[PDB]
Amino acid sequence: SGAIYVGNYRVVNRHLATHNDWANLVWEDSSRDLLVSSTTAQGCDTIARCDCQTGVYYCSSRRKHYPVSFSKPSLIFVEASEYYPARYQSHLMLAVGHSEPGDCGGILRCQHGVVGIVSTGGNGLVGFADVRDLLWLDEE
Ligand SMILES: [Zn+2]
């Protein structure tokens, strides 16, 4: 589990979104595994605006933050998980590291701020849904 809080937005894995999220929907994209809902309180997070490929991510199934190198966001085939069938996921970054389903929502951060959240795992990789292209998260 986990979310990003920026402005009056809450960014969550689409597959973990709640009824309240869907009832206060700003934007969602199944192909990206992302959903954004509206918040009353202002968020603590800053979104990275950059093309970093190194950062640190939180792994709940290890209670640890790990430094990682990761690929640039792309359209990647993802094997079946507990929460999706095998499918193509867009805007996905991969790193070598540990990720189980409940690790979804852990933040990946670089020197510029939040890069994305954990969205995929298995076979010794961790996949992250990028948010750095969502420039509208920083305004309105
Ligand atoms: Zn960066």
Q: Do 89 and 99 contact (CB within 8 A), yes or no?
A: no
Tell me the sheet residues that pair with 3: 12
Catalytic choice (21, 59, 104, 130): 104
- Tell me if 59 is assigned to a ligand binding site: no
CA angle 110, 62, 91 (to 5 degrees): 40
Approach to solving: X-ray
Give catalytic status of residue 130 as yes or no: no
User: Do the beta carbons of residue 11 and residue 34 sit within 8 Å?
Assistant: yes
Q: Coil, strand or helix: which one is 96?
A: strand
- In the chain, where are the structural domains located? 3-44, 45-140
DSSP characters for 31-49? GGTEEEEE-SSPPS--B--
Q: How far apart are CA 63 and CA 103, in angstroms?
A: 10
Q: Are 73 and 85 in contact (CB under 8 A)?
A: no
CA–CA dist 85, 137 (Å, integer): 29
Q: What is the C-alpha to C-alpha distance for residues 51 and 139, in angstroms, rounded to an integer? A: 20
